[PDB]
Amino acid sequence: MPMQMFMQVYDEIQMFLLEELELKFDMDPNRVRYLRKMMDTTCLGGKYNRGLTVIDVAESLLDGARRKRVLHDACVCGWMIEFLQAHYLVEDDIMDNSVTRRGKPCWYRHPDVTVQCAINDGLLLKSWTHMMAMHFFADRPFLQDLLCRFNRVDYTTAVGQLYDVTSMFDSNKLDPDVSQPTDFAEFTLSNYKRIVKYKTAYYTYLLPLVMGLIVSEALPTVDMGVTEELAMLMGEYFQVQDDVMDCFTPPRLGKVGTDIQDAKCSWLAVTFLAKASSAQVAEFKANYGSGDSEKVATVRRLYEEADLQGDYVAYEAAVAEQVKELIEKLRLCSPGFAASVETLWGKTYKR
Amino acid sequence: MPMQMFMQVYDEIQMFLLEELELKFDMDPNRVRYLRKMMDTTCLGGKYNRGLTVIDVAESLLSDGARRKRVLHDACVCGWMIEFLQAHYLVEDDIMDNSVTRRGKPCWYRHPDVTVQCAINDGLLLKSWTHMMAMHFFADRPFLQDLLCRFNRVDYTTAVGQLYDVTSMFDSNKLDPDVSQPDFAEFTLSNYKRIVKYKTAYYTYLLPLVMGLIVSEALPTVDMGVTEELAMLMGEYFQVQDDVMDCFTPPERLGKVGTDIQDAKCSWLAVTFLAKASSAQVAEFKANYGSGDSEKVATVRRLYEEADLQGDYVAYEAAVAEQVKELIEKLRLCSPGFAASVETLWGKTYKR
Lengths: 351, 352
Ligand SMILES: O=P(O)(O)C(O)(CCc1cccnc1)P(=O)(O)O
Ligand SMILES: O=P(O)(O)C(O)(CCc1cccnc1)P(=O)(O)O
Ligand SMILES: O=P(O)(O)C(O)(CCc1cccnc1)P(=O)(O)O
Ligand SMILES: O=P(O)(O)C(O)(CCc1cccnc1)P(=O)(O)O
Ligand SMILES: [Mg+2]
Ligand SMILES: [Mg+2]
Ligand SMILES: [Mg+2]
Ligand SMILES: [Mg+2]
Ligand SMILES: [Mg+2]
Ligand SMILES: [Mg+2]
Ligand SMILES: [Mg+2]
Ligand SMILES: [Mg+2]
Fold this sequence. Notes:
The structure is a homodimer. Chain A is mostly helical. Chain A has a single domain (1-351), classed as Farnesyl Diphosphate Synthase (Orthogonal Bundle), CATH 1.10.600. Chain A has helices at residues 2-24, 29-43, 49-61, 64-95, 115-136, 143-165, 189-216, 224-248, 267-275, 278-287, 293-305, 308-333, 335-346; strands at residues 100-101, 104-105. In chain A, strands 1-2 form a two-stranded antiparallel sheet. The longest helix of chain A has 32 residues, at 64-95. Chain A is globular. Chains A and B meet through α2, α4, α5, α6 and α7 of A and α2, α4, α5, α6 and α7 of B. The complex binds the ligand O=P(O)(O)C(O)(CCc1cccnc1)P(=O)(O)O (4 copies) and magnesium ion (MG) (8 copies). The site of one magnesium ion has 3 residues of chain A, from loops.
C-alpha cells in the first residue's frame, strides 16, 4: 500500500522528467526512450527500503489535505534517495569492473551502452534528484534546507568511496605523481568503521529519517545528536553482519560469499588482524585475496580459530543494547519518531 | 588584479574545504594531501575566463566599502563554483574519451598513482565541492536557494549536452541498451546546434552572467529573454569558430595540429558540408572521413575548400556579430552596466 503509493509517484516523477527533457531540452523520442530505459533499469528492482522509510517516518509523525501532501512529499523524497543510490551504484559498478547487479547485467555492461555514455548516464541520475526536488517542492518553505542537507549526504557518500578505494595500500605512499603498488597497513578497525560511516550509514539510515522529519515539519522536535548516533550505529551494524554472513552463512545466504577472494577490508579481516598472533597473521597474509580454493579455506579456518563468530555475537549484543537505550531517549520526547526508528532497526537486526 | 583577488579566494576556499574534511570527515593528512593535489592539478592551469567573467559583471554593476568588498568576494566564490564544475566535467570527460593530455599535462586519471576507479570518484568530489563552498560562504545570503536551483539547472543541462555529444555517432533509431551497437545520420545542423547549446553555452556563457547578477542583487533588472539569447549565440559561435580554425588555421598560428577530421567530429564544417554537398562529394567524404591516414585527411580538407565552407563561415560570423550587437543594444537601454560586461565577454570570443 505504501509500495503502491510509492510506485505511482515514480510514474508521476518519470513523466515530469521525460516531458521536461522534451519540452525544455529539445530532446527527441529516440533519446527520451533511451533515458526512460536507463531510469527504469537503474532505479527499479531493489526493495526501496530507503524510500519506504521516508514514507514510514512521515506516516508515523502524522483533515485529508495535509496528510495527502505530506505523504506525497515523502514519496518524492524517497525517490530522491533511490535515484542518488542508483547514481552511485552505476558509477561504482564501472569503478569496480563488476559484471552483474540485482540479477541483471550492470548498466554499462548492457550491449548498447558504452562506458563513455554510462559514466554520464550516472551523472544524469543525480541531477534528476535536484530536478524533481526543485519541481515538486518549488513552493515549500523547506526546499533550501532539504537541498543543503541532501547535498551534504551526497558529498559524504563520495568521501566514503574515497576511503573505500584507498583501503588497499599504505596511505603514506599515496601520491598521484608516483606509480602505485596490496598490503594490509590500512586494515584497522578505525579505518573500517570510517568507510562504513560515510559510504553507507548517512544516506542509508540518517538521510531517510531526516527527510521524513523535514516533510513532516517536525525536525526541531527531535534530538538530532542521538538520531545521528542511532544512524551511525545501525549503519555500521549492517555491514558487520553482512561481512560475517558472507563468511559463515552457507549458500541460505542467497549467494557464494567472495569477500576473502576479493581481498576485502571486512570486519572479519580487520578484527582478525588486530587480535591474531604473528604466526596466524603471516598465514593470513599468505592466503588472503586469492581465488584458490584451499587458500580461501585456510582463511576461513583462521577466522574460526580466532573465534570471530564469538566476537561478532558480543559485538551484536553490545550494539543492540546501545540502540535500545538511544531509542528510549528518543521515545521520551519523540514517540512517533522513535517508533519509526525502531521499525528501521527491525529490518536490520538479525536478518 | 581581478586575477590576484581570484587566486587569493581560491586559497581561502581550498583551506576551508581541506579543513572541513579533517574536522568533520575524520580525514587524515595523507588523504587530505591527495585531495589537495587533485584540486590543484584539476582546477588550476586554465585561464579562468568563466570565474573572471563573474567578477567583471559584478564590478560593472557596482554603479561604505563593505558592500563592494563582499559583493566582489561573492563573485569570486561563484567564479570558483563554475571552474570547479568545469573541472568536474573535464575529469569525467577525459576518462569517457580515453584522452591522454589536458592543458599540456597528463589527464588526471592518467597520472601514475591515480586509477580510473579513484578518478571517476575524484570527479564527483569536484562537483560536491561546488555545493559545499556555496553552502558555507553563502549560508546567510537571501539568494542561496535561487543560486543553488539555477546552478543545478545548468549542471543538469551540461550533462544533457554530453548525452547529445555521445549519441552523435549513429542513427538514433538504433539507440537501444538491449541491442549491441554498430553513420553520419545524426550529422545535421539542428543536432550540432543542440549539442553546443547544452554542453557548452549555458555553463560557459549564461551561468557566469547570471551569477554576476545574483551576487549583485540585480537579477530582476535585466531582460533575461535576450540575455539567454545572447548567451546561446555566443556559445554556438565559440565552437563554430574553433571548428573552422581546427581545419584552416595553420599549426604555427593555432597552437596545435587540429584532428577533428581524423577524430570524426560532428563539427560545424562536417554538418554544413553534408547539407550543401553533391551526392558525389558526399560519397568521397564518407569514404575518407575519420581516419588517421594523411591522404584521406587531405581529401576532406580539399572537399571543404571546394565547397567554400570558409565563405560560409565568413557569412555566418557576420550574421552572428550583427544579431549580437542588436541584442546588446536592447540590453544597454535598460541595463547599461550589464550590457557592457556582456560586450566585454563577447570581445574575448569574437576573434583571435
Ligand atoms: O562497491 P562495493 O563497496 O562492494 C558496494 O557496496 C557499493 C559501494 C557503494 C558505493 C556508494 C554507495 N553505496 C555502495 P556493492 O557491493 O558493489 O554494491
Ligand atoms: O554483498 P555485496 O554486494 O558486497 C554488499 O553490497 C551487500 C550490501 C547488501 C545490501 C542489502 C542486503 N545485503 C547486502 P556489501 O558491499 O558487501 O555490503
Ligand atoms: O571532448 P570534447 O567534448 O571535445 C570536449 O570539448 C569536452 C568539452 C566539455 C565536455 C563536457 C562539459 N564541458 C566541456 P574536450 O575538448 O575534450 O574538453
Ligand atoms: O580544441 P578542443 O580541445 O577540441 C576544444 O575543447 C576547444 C576548447 C577550446 C577552448 C578555448 C579555446 N580553444 C579551444 P572543443 O572540444 O573543440 O570545443
Ligand atoms: Mg561495487
Ligand atoms: Mg566499490
Ligand atoms: Mg558483502
Ligand atoms: Mg560489495
Ligand atoms: Mg567528450
Ligand atoms: Mg574529450
Ligand atoms: Mg577543437
Ligand atoms: Mg575536444
